[PDB]
Structure 1
């Protein structure tokens, strides 16, 4: 049951936009809302509006009086001397709650005229006609106007609606909540050479009487929220999908072949999401818009998605096809379960984010294989346990503070830190995988189909929300639908992993009792760490003995420590028979390293990742080597690679080398075995016999049979030896001689890989392989032996580093004339120049990176150069570079770059709270408090980034370096 927090119900909204002026960056328009009051004596009506100048408001064609105030413009007063962050977080939460449409509130308060009170008490319709104007919007709708001359279509100027969550208040007045569903009528009067893309279906396109402008009329009969309404106006090249004909793809001019190749996969994504769920795609059209200077890499609205043009690749670009493919896939998953089925509160957001991430993981499983699915699930679980042990924990479904261990309030999406938002979505889809583990996948897809079918029977009624609230899901409704389809309720699993905000830590060690033939496990939990919680459920453990692989369920109550499980025979060591594996197959194992008295080959605690856990198991090194070689699970091979770094014995070198030589191993395991072999080789110097590690293996796999030092000409058509070939010198460059310097046998090998590179014969580009070669050249740089702080001059230039510097100069200059893909070699060469500057080789001068960060280099070039400037101002304690970065945060045209500068200055801070630095003035505290209070008031993501930066630099209390 859904009861509105608003005293009115909104039925229909007309959004008309005229006079989109690109020179002056200005729009004019009106908005006409059709509300039905649910309570009599409505009097004031409270709507949401930011940055719009409200000209006049007429209610039922009668002139009404409005008052506007935004408390989130300046959160705390300018003349308050408070400088602690808890004060700002409480004031910011109160300010966002005072404009919240999820309460009854709002920023624009319109007073109902007196003569309509007899029209409002007996509950009859009210039609509110606001007309407004955006004069020059800061972060409302992004105007990308290039400075080439010509007409606005000839120079490539466009507008798009940017922002996250409820940010539609930034460009027209609305009820900007996900729970106020209404039908829509959208008119946009644009130039005759431009096209206006928006939500709904385009009913017509009429000309103006001078035929210089045309009006696009859109209609949206599926009741969506105001937060799902978008807009993209530009000189877009239109491409109808040749497979599905209601899907149109819009790109920027001169990028039509890239659009043709890139969006050619999307019909398979449509077919997948419509056959695992049994509902068809709910909207009547689908539109993909590719734009410049995007807010996020992929945004999903109702019947529309806005991607950045940096996803567009051609047919000869690999290492970008899977990333763009999965961006399209998660936009479509959010089309199904973020835009059609919406949110009932700010709680129950974990339901939608979990269903979107879970069905996108099912797509990844079918498309890229079960092994890529397991690797992705393991990397998300590691990312979560790292974040939750780092700071507090992520709390899905809080109850309204519920989480007081962290420096922001979780009551609203616009007060969350961006890393918390990312980890929120990540934990939501892993908890949905856990619900699939308890209640099987076919029942899970039946739950999702039951939600979609209720929403689509709801979506066709005309009753103003008598039935339109069946399109809003809640937690209680989701659990009730689960209990309807399965008969089991998941309330212990919901109580543990949703309502409780923690992950578990397992420390395991075993001992084999030879007398009674049992395996005594010893599993203890660390439940006193700040991020942890105590697990009391069951726990699966998989033991591989000589007779095969056996699963055991252990009951781990609070007082439990020793778990005795039984062991089988050892009669497959009496005769040589094959040892049967986890799957149905069996292999020949070399049992010379195994103990004579124990049959068990390896043990895995929680193999299926059925809890949110971090396992620290203490096996013997031969058990880790057997688990690396003969396991049929990629997460166990990865964890054995990760645990073999502590055992540098030559049997582990043989194990990793046998993994590296082995095709029919998953390629991301061999790419990890490269770096593990490099670390082991560095640890057993003065024992290593022959050549450096992986060199003979590289010449055996990727070089000519007649010439060992000449590499084969590039043929990248295998896509697994391409990735292994481009990752093996990067790990090989981490080799170090007893003198702690990279050997001149590996550096010469990398330089010969660079010289003899011929790419005139493959059908794929070479930009990522050459960029990884520059990364391998950067990995070999050891710190220089400066004497008496000698100025870095030609005489003290290392003879090794002169070759590296010549190569990166040649590569960067050739990129200036023949540019690659993603300026990947520019990014790699800027990263390598920063590596050479971090050691004492090149003079520590930020002027090169400051010229590449000037608004104009690839956004990738820009963020690489700004990363180099952030690293410089951390190491050299530069005041003027920090003022340069803070000025670039305040006034840069691209808001993604501002968010990225705040993000990089949070990750690599110039000082922490513990450090005494010269940069801890009262002036810097006043600048950052002014940046939290004012200055970042227009983005909701810059303000949370400024809160994160103030927390990283000065902590939760009063800045110490202050009177």
Structure 2
């Protein structure tokens, strides 16, 4: 049951936009809302509006009086001397709650005229006509106007609606909540050479009487919220999908072949999401818009998605196909379960984010294989356990503070830190995988189909929300639908992993009792760490003995420590028979390293990742080597690679080398075995016999049979030896000698890989392989032996580093004349120049990176150069570079770059709270408090980034370096 927090119900909204002026960055328009009051004596009506100048408001064609105030413009007063962050977080939460449409509130308060009170008490319709104007919007809707001359279509100027969550208040007045569903009528009067893309279906396109402008009329009969309404106006090249004909793809001019190749996969994503769920795609059209200077890499609205143009690749670009493919896939998953089925509160957001991430993981499983699915699930689980042990924990479904261990309030999406938002979505889809583990996948897809079917029977009624609230899901409704389809309720699993905000830590060690033939496990939990919680459920453990692989369920109550499980025979060591594996197959194992008295080959605690856990198991090194070689699970091979770094014995070198030589191993395991072999090789110097690690293996796999030092000409058509070939010198360059100087045998090998590179014969580009070669050249740089702080000149230039510097100069200059993809070689060469500057080789001068961080460059070059400037101002304690970065945060045209500068200055801070630095003035405290209070008031993501930066630099209490 859904009861509105608003005293009115909104039925229909007309959004008309005229006069989109690109020179002056200005729109004019009106908005006409059709509300039905649910309570008599409605009097004031409270709507949401930011940055719009409200000209006049007429209610039922009668002139009404409005008052506007935004408490989130300046959160605390300018003349308050408070400088602690808990004060700002409480004031910011109160300010966002005072404009919240999820309460009854709002920023624009319109007073109903007196003569309509007899029209409002007996509950009859009210039609509110506001007309407004955006004069020059800061972060409302982004105007990308290039400075080439010509007409606005000839120079490539466009507008798009940017922002996250409820940010539609930034460009027209609305009820900007996800729970106020209404039908829509959208008119946009644009230039005749431009096209206006929006939500709904385009019913017509009429000309103006001078035929210089045309009006696009859109209609949206599926009741969506105001927060799902978008807009993209530009000189877009239109491409109808040749497979599905209601899907149109819009790109920027001159990028039509890239659009043709890139969006050619999307019909398979549509077919997948419509056959695992049994509902068809709910909207009547689908539109993909590719734009410049995007807010996020992929945004999903109702019947529309806005991607950045940096996803567009051609047919000869690999290492970008899978990333763009999965961006399209998660946009479509959010089309199904973020835009059609919406949220009922700010709680129950974990339901929608979990269903979106879970069905996108099912797509990844079918498309890229179960092994890529397991690797992705393991990397997300490692991400969450790192974040939750780092700071507190992520609390899905809080109850309204519920989480007081962090520095922000979790009551609203616009007060969350961006890393918390990312980890929120990550934990939501892993908890949905856990619900699939308890209640099987076909029942899970039946739950999702029942939600979609209730929403689509709701979506066709005309009753103003008598039935339109069946399109809003809640937690209680989701659990009730689960209990309807399965008969089991998941309330212990919901109580543990949703309502409780923690992950578990397992420390395991075993001992084999030879007398009674048992395996005595010893599993203890660390439940006193700040991020942890105590697990009391069951726990699966998989033991591989000589007779095969056996699963055991252990009951781990609070007082439990020793778990005795039984062991089988050892009669497959009496005769040589094959040892049967986890799957149905069996292999020949070399049992010379195994103990004579124990049959068990390896043990895995929680193999299926059925809890949110971090396992620290103490096996013997031969058990880790057997688990690396003969396991049929990629997460166990990865964890054995990760645990073999502590055992540098030559049997582990043989194990990793046999993994590296082995095709029919998953390629991301071999790419990890490269770096593990490099670390082991660095640890057993003065024992290593022959050549450096992986060199003979590289010449055996990727070089000519007649010439060992000449590499084969590039043929990248295998896509697994391409990735292994481009990752093996990067790990080979980490080879550390006894003198701590990289062997001139590996550096010469990398330089010969660079010289003899011929790419005139493959059908794929070479930009990522050459960029990884520059990364391998940067990995070989050891710190220089400066004497008496000698000024770095050409007289003291290392003879090794002169070759590296010549190569990166040649590569960067050739990129200036012939570029590649993603400007990968510019990014790699800027990263390598920063590596050479971090050691004492090149003079520590930020002027090159400051010239590459200007506005007109590509955004990857910009963020690489700004990462170099952030690293410089951390190491050299530069005041003027920090003022340069803070000025660039305040006034840069691209807001993604501002968010990225705040993000990088949070990750690599110039000082922490423990450090005494010269940069801890009262002036810097006043600048960052002014940046939290004012200055970042227009983005909701810069303000949370400024809160994160103030927390990283000065902590939760009063800045110490202050009177």
Q: TM-score, normalised by structure 2?
A: 1.00
Secondary structure of 1:41's counterpart equals coil
Residues 821-867 of structure 1: per-residue CA shift (max 9 Å, x gap): 00000000000000000000000000000000011111000000000
1:556-612 deviation digits (Å, cap 9, x = unpaired): 000000000000000000000000000000000000000000000000000000000
Q: Cα offset for 1:737?
A: 1.1
Instruction: Say which SS state the counterpart of residue 795 (structure 1) adopts.
Output: coil
SS at match of 1:861: helix
* Residue-by-residue CA offset, 1:150-204 (whole Å, 9 max, x unaligned): 0000000000000000000000000000000000000000000000000000000
Q: Which residue of 2 aligns with 1:302?
A: 302
The 1-side partners of 2:612 and 2:819 are apart by 44
Partner of 1:149: 149
Q: Could you tell me how far 1:131 is from its partner in structure 2?
A: 0.0
1:164 alignment partner, SS class: coil
Q: Cα deviation per residue 1:450-504 (whole Å; 9 max; x = unaligned)?
A: 0000000000000000000000000000000000000000000000000000000
Q: Distance in 2 between matches of 1:332 and 1:856?
A: 32
Give distance in 1, aligned partners of 2:315 and 2:92: 48
The residue that corresponds to 2:351 in the other structure is 351
- Corresponding residue SS for 2:218: strand
Deviation at residue 736 of structure 1 after TM alignment: 1.1
Aligned counterpart, 1:239: 239
Deviation at 1:784, TM superposition (A): 0.0
1:260 pairs with 2:256? no
Once the two structures are TM-superposed, the CA of residue 431 in structure 1 deviates from its matched residue by 0.0
Instruction: Say if 2:6 is the partner of 1:6.
Output: yes
1:218-249 deviation per Cα after TM superposition (whole angstroms, max 9, x unaligned) = 00000000000000000000000000000000
Q: What secondary structure is seen at the aligned counterpart in 2 of 1:590?
A: coil
Deviations 1:702-761 (A, max 9, x none): 000000000000000000000000000000000011100100000000000000000000
Cα deviation per residue 1:921-946 (whole Å; 9 max; x = unaligned)? Answer: 00000000000000000000000000
SS of the residue 2:553 aligns to: strand
SS at match of 1:796: coil
Deviations 1:530-574 (A, max 9, x none): 000000000000000000000000000000000000000000000
Q: Helix, strand or coil for the counterpart of 1:351?
A: helix
Task: Map 1:85-96 onto structure 2 (within 5 A).
Answer: 85-96=85-96
Unaligned stretches of 5+ in structure 2? none
Output the CA distance in 1 between the equivalents of 2:921 and 2:943: 21
The C-alpha deviation readout for 1:228-271, integer Å capped at 9, x for no partner, is 00000000000000000000000000000000000000000000
Q: How far, CA to CA, are the matches of 1:858 and 1:387 in structure 2?
A: 31
What whole-Å deviation, never above 9, does each CA across 1:403-438 have from its counterpart, x for those lacking one?
000000000000000000000000000000000000
CA distance in 2, matches of 1:29, 1:59: 17
* Whole-angstrom distance in 2 between the partners of 1:793 and 1:19: 59
Partner SS, residue 163 of structure 1: coil
Partner Cα distance (2:743, 2:457) in 1: 69
Tell me which residue corresponds to 2:140: 140
1:342-382 deviation line (CA, Å, top 9, x unaligned): 00000000000000000000000000000000000000000
Q: 1 CA distance for matches of 2:633 and 2:682?
A: 28
> Distance in 2 between the 1:551 and 1:360 partners?
29
1:409 is aligned to 2:409:
yes
Aligned residue number for residue 665 of structure 1: 665
Q: Secondary structure at the match of 1:508?
A: strand
Q: In structure 2, what is the Cα distance between the partners aligned to 1:281 and 1:663?
A: 40
In structure 1, runs of 5+ residues without a counterpart are none
Counterpart-to-counterpart distance in 2, 1:87 and 1:559: 42
SS of residue in 2 equivalent to 1:19: strand
User: Please, what is the CA RMSD of the aligned residues?
Assistant: 0.1
CA distance in 1, matches of 2:150, 2:854: 25
Q: Is the partner of 1:685 in helix, strand or coil?
A: coil
Separation in structure 1 between the aligned mates of residue 465 and residue 251 of structure 2, nearest angstrom: 37
Question: Does the residue aligned with 1:757 lie in a helix, a strand or coil?
Answer: coil
Partners of 2:474 and 2:917 lie apart in 1 by 49
Query: Normalising to structure 1: TM-score of the pair?
Result: 1.00
For residue 319 of structure 2, give the secondary structure of its aligned residue in structure 1: coil
How far apart are the structure 2 equivalents of 1:261 and 1:949?
Answer: 41
Q: Which SS does the other structure have where 1:717 is aligned? A: coil
Identify the residue that residue 707 of structure 1 maps to in structure 2: 707
Structure 2 CA distance, aligned partners of 1:644 and 1:784? 31
SS in 2 for 1:624: helix
Matched residue count: 963
Note the C-alpha offset of 1:876: 0.0
Q: CA–CA distance in 2 between the matches of 1:467 and 1:503? A: 39
CA distance in 2, matches of 1:826, 1:90: 44
Which whole-Å CA distance do the structure 1 matches of 2:383 and 2:286 have between them? 33
> 2-side partners of 1:6 and 1:737: how far apart?
70
In 2, distance between residues paired with 1:644 and 1:605? 17
Secondary structure, counterpart of 2:795 in structure 1: helix
User: 2:961 is paired with a residue of what secondary structure?
Assistant: coil
Question: How far 1:114 moved relative to its partner?
Answer: 0.0
Q: What CA deviation, in whole Å up to 9, does each residue of 1:744-793 have, x standing for no partner? A: 00000000000000000000000000000000000000000000000000
State the 1:133 CA deviation. Answer: 0.0
State the alpha-carbon separation in 1 of the partners of residues 826 and 383 from structure 2: 29
Q: How many Å separate the matches in 1 of 2:187 and 2:178?
A: 22
Q: Which residue of 2 is the match for residue 747 of structure 1? A: 747
CA distance in 1, matches of 2:173, 2:485: 41
Alpha-carbon distance between aligned partners in 2 of 1:538 and 1:658, rounded to the nearest angstrom: 36
Quick one: distance in 1 between partners of 2:747 and 2:198?
54
**SS state at 1:740 partner:** coil
Q: Which residue of 2 aligns with 1:831?
A: 831
